[PDB]
Amino acid sequence: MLKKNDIVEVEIVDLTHEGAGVAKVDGLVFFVENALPSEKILMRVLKVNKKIGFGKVEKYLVQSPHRNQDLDLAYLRSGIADLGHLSYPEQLKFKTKQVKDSLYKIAGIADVEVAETLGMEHPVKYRNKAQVPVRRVNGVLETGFFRKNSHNLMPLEDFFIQDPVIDQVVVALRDLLRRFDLKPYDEKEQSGLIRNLVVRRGHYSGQIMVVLVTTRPKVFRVDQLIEQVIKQFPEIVSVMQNINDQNTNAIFGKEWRTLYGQDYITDQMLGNDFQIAGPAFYQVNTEMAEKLYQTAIDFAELKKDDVIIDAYSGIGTIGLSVAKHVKEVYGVELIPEAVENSQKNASLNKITNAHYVCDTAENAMKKWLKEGIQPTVILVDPPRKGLTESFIKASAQTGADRIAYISCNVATMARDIKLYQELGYELKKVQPVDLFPQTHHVQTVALLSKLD
RNA sequence: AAAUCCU
Ligand SMILES: Nc1ncnc2c1ncn2[C@@H]1O[C@H](CSCC[C@H](N)C(=O)O)[C@@H](O)[C@H]1O
């Protein structure tokens, strides 16, 4: 019978989907941070529960051959790069395995093709967006990242997985906030002004948005602070402000203001251009998203007489990438600022067959089913939570030949696939694509197809 | 349960 602060020798024999090592000691399953399969360790017992436990590595007796000894990545492991300690080919194997394991555990599929995960040539310096808290650490305003399961800011200049320019811009903005004596936010004391900095930068265009996320509308000498950052970085076309007065883990509140220039950046994906608002979603890994889409598009086998639904449209990138190669494109997007981009993105690219509606995807499908639209293909790309039961049920009743499901969470996709199978759709292909190198997150594309 | 970390 184990208990807190005991040290025991264990072999790690698996990984959780989130990246934590698994060892099984005396009826307990232990989740050990920074422990890879086959590693011998002395495990410190942190917490004992009924069926599970939690552990810390006290000593490595034997490490993995697949361990990455990079000391620079180890600082990030407890946070933004939670799989950095595993070598890249094995990360890919791990992610492929996770997709297979989820389709079985959740949906009872063992017989379907799951191609190996498509990885990056150079899996670094990829993210086009960065969200960076601003905090006081030892009486000094610092940008960085939060330690896992915490709000303790780890000071950091080199983010490893982000666009190097974004790191330069965030370091510049940190130094400017220090010089202008603008107070960082304190969560516990509920005092200060500057909560987070959000910096999006177009993968091809290089055009930069800077969102200053603050506790109150009034920012003291912000016009001068912008004036200086534009001289360092001429590529800033937009400086936005966001007010968030709540005590919440959520980044933005309701109010968005434009402090300078445009209220959008412009970037390329596949052939076309796309305007992108601050509150709108843009795929963080443009390089691999283009691949993610090109897989989905090839899976969909598009004819000129097809009628596509692009559910969870965003700024319209999937729908508009295919609109010139088909009859009609209908899309739905809940966030007004994104679906307004989507409308302009259609006009920019000369696409007059791209019709959009601002609503929940659940509701848009219900109206489109009543209104008598005849969709042949359905592309879906929901957030982690996945799809609603009512959306799956409605989409089945449209009699759509193919459904292509893009996902950033295989757990919810496996569930939702399970329900598509109960309504006469069959899972044909699956291709995982590594949008998030050095992290536990798997992106996926699954082709469902109907039976007569 | 909103988003790479952001209980
Ligand atoms: N119930 C709902 N109905 C429609 N859209 C929703 C929704 N819940 C969240 N969303 C939206 O779904 C989108 C998911 S991500 C959008 C992906 C887009 N195709 C792109 O690659 O750019 C977000 O834009 C989000 O605002």
Residue numbers in the entry: 1 to 452
Wording from the paper:
In this research, using protein-RNA crystal structures, we demonstrate that multiple structural determinants collaborate to establish the dual enzymatic activities of RlmCD, which has been previously shown to catalyze C5 methylation at both U747 and U1939 of 23S rRNA in some gram-positive bacteria. However, in S. pneumoniae and Bacillus subtilis, which both belong to gram-positive bacteria, RlmCD and its homologue YefA have been proven to be dual-functional methyltransferases to catalyze both m5U747 and m5U1939 in 23S rRNA. In all structures, the cofactors were modeled as SAH, due to the missing electron density of the methyl group, while its density was clearly observed attaching to the base C5 atom of U747 or U1939, indicating that the complexes gained in the crystal structures all exist as the trapped enolate intermediate 3, given that E443Q eliminates the final step of proton abstraction from C5.
A similar RNA design was also applied to co-crystalize the RlmCD with SAM and an 8-nt U1939-containing RNA stretches (5′-1936AAAUUCCU1943-3′, U1939L) to understand the mutual recognition between RlmCD and U1939 site on 23S rRNA. Interestingly, in the RlmCD-SAH-U1939L complex structure, the U1939-containing RNA substrate also adopts a very similar conformation to that of U747L, even though their sequences are totally different, suggesting that both RNAs were re-shaped by the catalytic groove of RlmCD to adopt an optimal conformation for protein-RNA recognition and subsequent catalysis reaction. The nucleotide base-flipping was also observed for U1939 in the RlmCD-SAH-U1939L structure. Compared with U747, U1939 in the structure of RlmCD-SAH-U1939L exhibits a totally identical interaction mode with RlmCD, suggesting that the catalytic mechanism RlmCD employed for two different RNA substrates are quite similar. As the corresponding nucleotide to G748 in U1939L, however, U1940 maintains only one hydrogen bond with the main chain hydroxyl group of Q131 using its base, while the Q131 main chain is also involved in two additional hydrogen bonds with the bases of C1941 and C1942, respectively. N249, whose side-chain originally makes multiple hydrogen bonds with the bases of three different nucleotides in the RlmCD-SAH-U747L structure, forms only one side-chain-to-base hydrogen bond with A1937. The most striking difference between the two complex structures of RlmCD is that the aromatic side-chain of F145 in RlmCD-SAH-U1939L swings away from its position in RlmCD-SAH-U747L by an angle of ~135°, without disturbing the base-stacking between U1940 and C1941. In addition, the side-chain of F146 also shifts by ~1.4 Å away from RNA nucleotide.
